Design a protein around this motif. Sequence first.
Motif, short mmCIF file in Angstrom:
data_model
loop_
_atom_site.label_atom_id
_atom_site.label_comp_id
_atom_site.label_asym_id
_atom_site.label_seq_id
_atom_site.Cartn_x
_atom_site.Cartn_y
_atom_site.Cartn_z
N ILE A 161 -6.81 11.28 0.70
CA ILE A 161 -6.41 12.32 -0.23
C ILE A 161 -6.48 11.79 -1.65
O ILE A 161 -6.68 12.56 -2.59
CB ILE A 161 -4.99 12.85 0.08
CG1 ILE A 161 -4.99 13.55 1.44
CG2 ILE A 161 -4.56 13.87 -0.97
CD1 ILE A 161 -3.63 13.81 2.02
N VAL A 162 -6.29 10.49 -1.84
CA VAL A 162 -6.36 9.94 -3.18
C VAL A 162 -7.76 10.07 -3.72
O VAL A 162 -7.98 10.56 -4.83
CB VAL A 162 -5.92 8.47 -3.20
CG1 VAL A 162 -6.09 7.88 -4.60
CG2 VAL A 162 -4.48 8.35 -2.71
N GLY A 163 -8.73 9.56 -2.96
CA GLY A 163 -10.08 9.88 -3.31
C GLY A 163 -10.15 11.37 -3.12
O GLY A 163 -10.26 11.86 -2.00
N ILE A 164 -10.07 12.09 -4.23
CA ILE A 164 -10.09 13.54 -4.16
C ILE A 164 -11.54 13.92 -4.35
O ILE A 164 -12.36 13.11 -4.77
CB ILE A 164 -9.21 14.23 -5.21
CG1 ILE A 164 -9.61 13.87 -6.65
CG2 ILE A 164 -7.78 13.91 -4.91
CD1 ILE A 164 -8.93 14.74 -7.74
N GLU A 198 -1.95 10.86 -9.20
CA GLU A 198 -2.34 12.18 -8.73
C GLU A 198 -2.02 13.26 -9.76
O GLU A 198 -2.82 14.17 -9.97
CB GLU A 198 -1.63 12.47 -7.42
CG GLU A 198 -1.97 13.81 -6.76
CD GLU A 198 -3.41 13.88 -6.30
OE1 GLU A 198 -4.00 12.82 -6.03
OE2 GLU A 198 -3.95 15.00 -6.20
N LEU A 224 -1.25 5.87 5.81
CA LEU A 224 -1.65 5.43 4.49
C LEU A 224 -3.13 5.67 4.26
O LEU A 224 -3.55 6.00 3.15
CB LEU A 224 -1.36 3.95 4.32
CG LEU A 224 0.11 3.56 4.36
CD1 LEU A 224 0.20 2.09 4.35
CD2 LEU A 224 0.81 4.10 3.17
N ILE A 253 -0.06 5.48 -6.91
CA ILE A 253 -1.20 6.38 -6.82
C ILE A 253 -0.72 7.82 -6.87
O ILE A 253 -1.36 8.68 -7.50
CB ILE A 253 -1.98 6.09 -5.53
CG1 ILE A 253 -2.57 4.67 -5.60
CG2 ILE A 253 -3.08 7.06 -5.40
CD1 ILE A 253 -3.14 4.10 -4.32
N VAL A 312 -3.70 9.14 3.14
CA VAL A 312 -3.37 9.29 1.73
C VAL A 312 -4.57 8.90 0.90
O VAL A 312 -5.13 9.73 0.17
CB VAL A 312 -2.14 8.44 1.35
CG1 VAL A 312 -1.86 8.48 -0.14
CG2 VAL A 312 -0.92 8.94 2.05
N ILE A 313 -5.05 7.68 1.10
CA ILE A 313 -6.14 7.17 0.28
C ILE A 313 -7.42 7.96 0.50
O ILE A 313 -8.34 7.88 -0.31
CB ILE A 313 -6.31 5.65 0.49
CG1 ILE A 313 -6.67 5.30 1.93
CG2 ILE A 313 -5.03 4.95 0.09
CD1 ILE A 313 -7.09 3.84 2.16
N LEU A 323 -14.23 22.51 -10.69
CA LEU A 323 -13.97 22.18 -12.08
C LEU A 323 -15.24 22.29 -12.93
O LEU A 323 -15.25 23.05 -13.91
CB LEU A 323 -13.28 20.82 -12.11
CG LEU A 323 -11.92 20.82 -11.37
CD1 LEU A 323 -11.29 19.43 -11.22
CD2 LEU A 323 -10.92 21.76 -12.03
N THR A 382 -8.13 14.94 -16.43
CA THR A 382 -9.26 15.84 -16.27
C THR A 382 -9.14 17.00 -17.23
O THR A 382 -10.13 17.42 -17.84
CB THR A 382 -9.27 16.33 -14.83
OG1 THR A 382 -9.41 15.21 -13.95
CG2 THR A 382 -10.35 17.31 -14.58
N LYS A 435 -4.47 12.98 -12.55
CA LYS A 435 -5.86 13.26 -12.17
C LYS A 435 -6.34 14.53 -12.81
O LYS A 435 -7.40 14.58 -13.44
CB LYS A 435 -5.99 13.39 -10.66
CG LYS A 435 -5.86 12.13 -9.92
CD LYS A 435 -6.05 12.36 -8.45
CE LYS A 435 -5.80 11.08 -7.69
NZ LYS A 435 -5.94 11.20 -6.21
N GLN A 475 -16.07 24.50 -15.74
CA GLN A 475 -16.36 24.28 -17.14
C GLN A 475 -17.62 25.04 -17.51
O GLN A 475 -17.77 25.47 -18.65
CB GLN A 475 -16.51 22.80 -17.45
CG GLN A 475 -17.76 22.23 -16.91
CD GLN A 475 -17.75 20.73 -16.88
OE1 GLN A 475 -16.84 20.09 -17.41
NE2 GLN A 475 -18.74 20.15 -16.21
N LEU A 493 -12.08 18.02 -19.74
CA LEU A 493 -12.90 19.20 -19.58
C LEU A 493 -12.80 20.14 -20.76
O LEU A 493 -13.79 20.81 -21.10
CB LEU A 493 -12.48 19.93 -18.31
CG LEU A 493 -12.70 19.16 -17.02
CD1 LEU A 493 -12.15 19.91 -15.88
CD2 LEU A 493 -14.14 18.93 -16.75
N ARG A 498 0.82 -1.20 0.00
CA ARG A 498 0.00 0.00 0.00
C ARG A 498 0.85 1.25 0.00
O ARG A 498 0.42 2.28 -0.51
CB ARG A 498 -0.95 0.05 1.19
CG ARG A 498 -1.91 1.26 1.12
CD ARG A 498 -2.94 1.30 2.22
NE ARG A 498 -3.99 0.29 2.10
CZ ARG A 498 -4.89 0.05 3.04
NH1 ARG A 498 -4.89 0.72 4.19
NH2 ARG A 498 -5.81 -0.88 2.83
#
Lengths: 53, 53
Positions: free
Chosen positions: B12-15, A41, B6, A37, B9-10, B21, A48, A44, B25, A52, A30
């Motif tokens: 933060i990974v799932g943002i 980032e 960790l 991961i 992080v994950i 945005l 995106t 991402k 757009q 967009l 992990r």
Amino acid sequence: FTLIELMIVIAIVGILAAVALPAYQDYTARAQVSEAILLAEGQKSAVTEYYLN
Amino acid sequence: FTLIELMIVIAIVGILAAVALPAYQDYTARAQVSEAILLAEGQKSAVTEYYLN
């Protein structure tokens, strides 16, 4: 007589070698899975960015 | 033990991938919507020109 004191050593000698090593090579994984991961980032927003615009 | 490092992080990974945005757009849209408006700017006076004369 002391042997049971030696017995208990050889019970300590046969260690578990805890699954908290291989569950944490899986979570050391992990870590460097996260290293993958953390690459992602960057993409991402860039992925995106294409998505967009 | 480090896993909660960790975990976070994950988290933060799932943002979010902020609505800043897609609301931008929608306001990037306001940019090229404006690009349509800036066209209209030319016709403002020309349409007016017919309307007045």
